[PDB]
Structure formats: structure tokens, C-alpha cells
Amino acid sequence: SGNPFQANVEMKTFMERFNLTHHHQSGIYVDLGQDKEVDGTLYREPAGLCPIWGKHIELQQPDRPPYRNNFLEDVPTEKEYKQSGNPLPGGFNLNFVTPSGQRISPFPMELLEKNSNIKASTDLGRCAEFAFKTVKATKYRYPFVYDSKKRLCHILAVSMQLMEGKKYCSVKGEPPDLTWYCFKPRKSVTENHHLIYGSAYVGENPDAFISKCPNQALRGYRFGVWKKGRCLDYTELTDTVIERVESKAQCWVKTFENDGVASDQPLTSQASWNDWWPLHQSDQPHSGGVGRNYGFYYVDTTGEGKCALSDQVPDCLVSDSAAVSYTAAGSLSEETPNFIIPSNTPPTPETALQCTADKFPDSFGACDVQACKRQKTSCVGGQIQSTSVDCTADEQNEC
Ligand SMILES: *[C@@H]1O[C@H](CO)[C@@H](O)[C@H](O)[C@H]1NC(C)=O
């Protein structure tokens, strides 16, 4: 009878957007899928094509001045690090100033929107284009953070994303001998949803991410894989991790902070006070975006908020009007926000899940005799429905 989310061009192109292995093509928790040579040494470089919503690097600095514990503060100056002693004060922000003595980052969006050289149609893409178009003279492309609330575009001099261990870096000052404070990738239930992280390469095709990335939570559907002639949401799969959550927010954080998330990160040196970029290592992994990136919040039959998490690139959806499907790349929110909608170039449709009952009639599958359930695909108040129901009484003789 067919997988309905595949028996259509419109469906296909739409299910493709959640496929992070396809367009994003790189680590999400850590993103370092490319190499680039600078001053004769080979460094890792972020390369993912998709923007990562809510992602910030949490620092672990001492809780005393001069330490701000915010990665959007400037990379420190030599003088500032002379004054502070170990570990480094400051944040990850590029702090270069042009010859004119004008400042690179953070850079105002109002300036970008009125620049012809900036050919992107959306504010997020403009920042991205700017990241991509601006790097004593190198070919390295810094990753960037768009502060979408302050409309400032940040270029990040530091590409490192994760450092831990008493062998590498200090935590809150301890041990006190270490040059670097530790830091990791974070997503928070409450903090910083308005920051967007990305490799420069989001900017090469500054409009592409609009339809090739899973930017938003998908409200009212669970990620699923087509099997045994029906859509199996992750709960029905053996490889899936399921964790009890208190709010749909924790689930979303989990799709990004779980152990299996696409990660391009066992370092082999104490970074110098000045090494803003990971070194290329012989055995470095490139995830390509393969990972436990996918997940949804649902409530089970007993009233519990749960969180299914899978590494299976989904190819069908199970309707569940309470559910929200998250990935590592996109936002908690499910509303297209103003900064990825052209300022004007008409918007690109996703009508892939709109329907009428007349042109979209109840279609039933054959009986999965192992689960004694069958696919039913319908249209209810203008939206596609996809669930696994009871077989007929007849078919039941076979389970
Ligand atoms: C996702 O994309 C990759 C590479 O483009 C592909 O090999 C894989 O089959 C895709 N997974 C799907 C469509 O479920």
C-alpha cells in the first residue's frame, strides 16, 4: 500500500529536511567536520550546513572578577591574561578591528540588512553570510552565533566546543595551573533560546537552510520509521532510549545533550593560551551527522511525560496532537520566528501536511501480525493523520 510520507514528491522533500546526514552533513553537539591549514598547521574547522538553535558554550571560569562566564565576551587580550593569571579570562568572541578601526564582532544586523553585498533574504542568513564572507591573512572560517534578540551577529574566534579533564583545563579555578577553563556545548530549558550557533558554511548558501534544515520543533507528530507496512514511532523500536521528562523542554535539550548525538569530538595537547582551534589528529572522527539526533516528547498511557530518542533518520510521522518532535539542530519553539522569514522573495511553502478528506481518504494497511496493529492514514480538520490502529476482526485470527 506504501509509506504515504514517501509516496509523494512533496512528502519526500519534506521528510528530507529532518535528515541531518543529508544537508547538515557534520557534528551537532561538536561540529568540526572539515580541516583547514593556517600558518602551516592543520586545524579542525566547523562545517555543518545547518544552524543550531539554542546551542551555547557554557564556560567554567572562577566565579570571581575578572571572570564573566559568558562565551560572547571577547577573546582576551594578552594584557588581560597577564592581569588575571590562570585560567584565561574572557569569552570566545572574535575582537579583531579593521584598518578603518571599525569592529568585526558582534556586528549589528541593521548594517547587514542595508548592504547589497549581503545577498541573503533572512536576518539569520545575513549573519551567516557575513560569517562566511569575513575571515596575518587566512582561509579559516570561524563559526558564528546570531544573538537574535539583540540583533547582533557574533563571529567566534574560538572554534573549540568541548574541553574537559583535570589534564586539560580547570573547573572554577581548580586545578590552578591550567591555562584553559573548561567549557562544553549546552542547551537549556530556559536560557538562551535566542542564540543560534553555526559553522561559517551556513552562509555559503545563506538561503538553503530555510528548506534543508529542521529549524523548528515539529508540533503534533512523532518521528517514525516505515516498517512492517506501517509507521513505527521510536517507542516501538528496540534501539531507542526512552527517558522520563517533566516538560517538553527537557526532551528537546536531551535530543542535543544525549551521549549519542552527532559529535565530531581524546585530545593530544595542552592548548596554549592562544590556540583558538582544535588540532587535526590522525584518528579524528567525522560524524557526517550520523547520531542519536532525533527525539520526541509524548505522554504515555499512564500519564507520564516521556522522551523517546533515536538515531534513526525518520521517514514517516505518527500523528499525536500532544507530541512534539525535536532534533539536535532546531528550536524548542515550533513557530517560524521573524528572523528566518524574508524581510520582503516569497516564502517557501510547507503545505506537505495539509489535506482535505475528499482528496485524502482513510487508507488502511495490511495487518502487522506480530504487533497485531495496522496503518491508518487519514485527514482530520485539514491535517494529515497517521497512526497504528486495531486490525479487523478477520485479520486477528492471524496474530
Ligand atoms: C539521509 O541522507 C543520506 C545521505 O544523503 C542517505 O544515504 C540516507 O539514506 C538518508 N536517510 C533517509 C532518507 O532515511
UniProtKB/Swiss-Prot annotation:
Region of interest called DIII, as start-end residue ranges on this chain: 339-399
Start and end residues of each stretch annotated as DI: 1-214
Annotated stretches, region: DII: 215-338
Residue ranges, Extracellular side: 1-399
Disulphides: C50-C213, C127-C153, C169-C182, C231-C316, C251-C307, C355-C379, C367-C391, C372-C399
List of glycosylated residues: N19
Protein's UniProt name: Apical membrane antigen 1, soluble form
